[PDB]
Design an enzyme around this catalytic site. Structure first.
Site, short mmCIF file in Angstrom:
data_model
loop_
_atom_site.label_atom_id
_atom_site.label_comp_id
_atom_site.label_asym_id
_atom_site.label_seq_id
_atom_site.Cartn_x
_atom_site.Cartn_y
_atom_site.Cartn_z
CB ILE A 13 12.32 88.07 78.99
CG1 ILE A 13 12.75 87.47 79.90
CG2 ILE A 13 12.19 89.65 78.30
CD1 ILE A 13 13.95 86.38 79.43
N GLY A 14 8.63 87.44 80.64
CA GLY A 14 8.22 86.66 81.17
C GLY A 14 7.74 86.16 82.55
N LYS A 15 6.79 85.46 82.72
CA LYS A 15 7.13 84.87 84.53
C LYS A 15 6.51 83.33 83.51
N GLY A 16 7.00 82.58 85.01
CA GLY A 16 6.86 81.30 84.92
C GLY A 16 5.68 81.06 86.06
CB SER A 17 5.04 77.71 87.70
OG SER A 17 4.12 77.19 86.72
N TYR A 18 6.26 80.52 89.12
CA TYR A 18 6.45 81.33 90.11
C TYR A 18 7.38 82.03 90.66
N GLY A 19 7.56 83.21 90.42
CA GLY A 19 8.45 84.10 90.19
C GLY A 19 8.69 84.52 88.46
CB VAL A 21 12.05 84.71 83.24
CG1 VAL A 21 13.10 84.56 82.30
CG2 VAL A 21 11.39 83.86 84.01
CG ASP A 129 3.93 72.53 80.26
OD1 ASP A 129 2.90 72.35 79.65
OD2 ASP A 129 4.11 73.40 81.11
C1 E5J Z 1 15.08 87.77 73.90
O1 E5J Z 1 14.45 86.37 74.71
C2 E5J Z 1 12.46 86.30 74.83
C3 E5J Z 1 11.77 86.79 74.96
C4 E5J Z 1 10.44 86.45 75.14
N1 E5J Z 1 9.89 87.10 74.96
C5 E5J Z 1 9.50 88.78 75.10
C6 E5J Z 1 8.08 89.80 75.10
C7 E5J Z 1 7.01 88.84 74.05
N2 E5J Z 1 5.33 89.85 74.03
C8 E5J Z 1 5.22 90.18 75.39
C9 E5J Z 1 6.24 90.92 73.61
C10 E5J Z 1 7.22 87.16 74.79
C11 E5J Z 1 7.87 86.47 74.36
C12 E5J Z 1 10.21 85.00 75.54
C13 E5J Z 1 11.34 84.42 76.22
C14 E5J Z 1 12.79 85.01 75.88
N3 E5J Z 1 13.84 83.77 75.51
C15 E5J Z 1 14.35 83.08 76.68
N4 E5J Z 1 15.27 83.09 76.85
C16 E5J Z 1 15.90 81.77 77.88
C17 E5J Z 1 14.58 81.74 79.09
CL1 E5J Z 1 15.28 79.84 79.87
C18 E5J Z 1 13.72 82.05 78.43
N5 E5J Z 1 12.38 81.87 79.88
C19 E5J Z 1 11.17 82.52 80.14
C20 E5J Z 1 10.86 83.83 79.12
C21 E5J Z 1 9.10 84.09 79.33
C22 E5J Z 1 7.87 83.38 79.93
C23 E5J Z 1 8.68 82.01 80.14
C24 E5J Z 1 10.34 81.19 79.75
P1 E5J Z 1 10.22 80.25 80.18
C25 E5J Z 1 9.65 78.73 79.74
C26 E5J Z 1 11.92 79.22 81.54
O2 E5J Z 1 9.83 79.01 81.63
N6 E5J Z 1 13.12 83.11 77.61
#
Ligand code: E5J
EC number: 2.7.11.17
Length: 265
Positions: A13-19, A21, A129
């Site tokens: 679902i995404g990337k943070g700084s390292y690793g 998600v 941040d």
């Molecule tokens: C359906 O849930 C989510 C969906 C999405 N996306 C889905 C695809 C979209 N585009 C590319 C099509 C982009 C947004 C993002 C976050 C969550 N939910 C979510 N819940 C809890 C957490 Cl701890 C979390 N972390 C996270 C996810 C991605 C990036 C960074 C963090 P952090 C802010 C911890 O560094 N994310």
């Protein structure tokens, strides 16, 4: 979909700084979680940034703050897993965007942010941040403050900091001196909330440049300008201006923000 204990990892679902998600389905619970997957090899080359964040997250219980549910730390494996409650709608917005929030949607989220930051400041945490991509929209339409990877825990009524961390577009001017300096951590958070609220309604940051020193220079010395479209109310322009006061002494504080007319109407 790799299985780890009770969980089945699905899409990134995404990337943070390292690793990374990953969305994760739990077989014990029949529900989804967000799993941060970190490589300890990669953290040992460049964190102790991971275990401080974890110690902070364990202290934090608020409906406007992401909840850490468990840490899977095997001493004899490379990966370290961090399991969060999924915030299912993702970030409140992407910046820049041609489709910003309405003034009313912005107020709703901005009220949530005040509540969350106030809790964090009460727990003696400076986030450092605050920005739209760290504000995750939940099932109920409310936001949860995420990503404590550069936050600082303090003793006292404020943090007194000198290190420059965070996202450059949301860094306050007092933190961008060439000489080492000391600045209030709470006022940093407030300035970042102001850049955030500016983005909520205009879909871009108030100060922008791809060049880091041109960006710092504008943050420190360029007066705040509001575009012609959208036309936003004068009560909103006043709150943003007070939060983006370049003087941290006179910058509005969180108790004052709460009593501001844009907020209480
Ligand atoms: C359906 O849930 C989510 C969906 C999405 N996306 C889905 C695809 C979209 N585009 C590319 C099509 C982009 C947004 C993002 C976050 C969550 N939910 C979510 N819940 C809890 C957490 Cl701890 C979390 N972390 C996270 C996810 C991605 C990036 C960074 C963090 P952090 C802010 C911890 O560094 N994310």
């Amino acid at each position: 979909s790799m299985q780890l204990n009770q969980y089945t990892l699905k899409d990134e679902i995404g990337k943070g700084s390292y690793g990374v998600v990953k969305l994760a389905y739990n077989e014990n619970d029949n529900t989804y979680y967000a799993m941060k997957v970190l490589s300890k090899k990669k953290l040992i080359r460049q964190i102790e940034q991971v275990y401080q964040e974890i110690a902070i997250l364990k202290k934090l219980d608020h409906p406007n703050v992401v909840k850490l549910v468990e840490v899977l730390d095997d001493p004899n494996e490379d990966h370290l897993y961090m399991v969060f409650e999924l915030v299912n709608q993702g970030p409140v917005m992407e910046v820049p965007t041609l489709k910003p929030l309405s003034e009313d949607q912005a107020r709703f989220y901005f009220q949530d942010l005040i509540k969350g930051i106030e809790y964090l400041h009460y727990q003696k945490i400076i986030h450092r941040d605050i920005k739209p991509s760290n504000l995750l929209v939940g099932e109920d339409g409310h936001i949860k403050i995420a990503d404590f990877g550069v936050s600082n825990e303090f003793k006292g009524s404020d943090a007194l900091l000198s290190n420059t961390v965070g996202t450059p577009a949301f860094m306050a001017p007092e933190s961008l001196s060439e000489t080492r300096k000391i600045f209030s951590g709470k006022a940093l958070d407030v300035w970042a909330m102001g850049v955030t609220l500016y983005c909520f309604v205009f879909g871009q940051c108030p100060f922008m440049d791809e060049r880091i020193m041109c960006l710092h220079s504008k943050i420190k010395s360029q007066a705040l300008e509001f575009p012609d479209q959208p036309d936003i109310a004068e009560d909103l322009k006043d709150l943003i201006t007070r939060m983006l006061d370049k003087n941290p002494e006179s910058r509005i504080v969180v108790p004052e923000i709460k009593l501001h007319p844009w907020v209480t109407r």
